């Protein structure tokens, strides 16, 4: 019964976690494409990278 | 691609146009110290020679 409960709940827990991962990945690539022009320095880029990790 | 806001771009474009207007207002004086003939015709004598 609690195996069935985990089957019922992980299929949206892991999907919300994948949406979190896609959101942080778009955040990191957007911070990279605002670093590459030259607006903000490399330390906030490393902060976005460690948040993605 | 919407990295910075659409309002921060308006602030930066306003600062850019204010600085360009300051450059143009500061080269108006640099053109004023090159004193130009406002008309075209015969010129008389120089009542103020160079150095004064």
Q: Using an 8 Å Cβ cutoff, are A28 and A47 in contact?
A: no
Give the 3-state secondary structure of residue B4. coil
What is the spatial distance between Cα A12 and Cα B7, in angstroms, rounded to a whole number? Answer: 37
Contacts of A34 (CB under 8 A, 6+ apart): A40, B3, B4
What does the radius of gyration of chain A's CA atoms come to, in whole angstroms? Answer: 17
What's the reported resolution, in angstroms, to a tenth? 3.8
Q: Using an 8 Å Cβ cutoff, are B16 and A46 in contact?
A: no
Q: Which two tokens stand for residue A52?
A: 């993605």
- d(CA B8, nearest CA chain A) in Å: 12
Asked whether the beta carbons of residue A30 and residue B1 sit closer than 8 angstroms, the reply is yes
Asked whether the beta carbons of residue B1 and residue A33 sit closer than 8 angstroms, the reply is yes
What is the spatial distance between Cα A18 and Cα B52, in angstroms, rounded to a whole number? Answer: 80
């Amino acid at each position: 019964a609690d195996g069935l409960a985990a089957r019922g709940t992980f299929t949206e827990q892991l999907q919300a976690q994948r949406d979190l991962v896609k959101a942080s990945d778009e955040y990191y690539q957007l911070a990279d494409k605002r670093y590459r022009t030259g607006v903000d320095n490399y330390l906030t880029l490393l902060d976005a990278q460690r948040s993605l990790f | 691609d919407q990295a910075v806001s659409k309002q921060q771009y308006a602030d930066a474009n306003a600062a850019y146009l204010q600085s360009k207007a300051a450059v143009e207002q500061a080269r108006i004086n640099l053109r004023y110290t090159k004193v130009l003939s406002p008309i075209s015709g015969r010129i008389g004598r120089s009542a103020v020679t160079e150095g004064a």
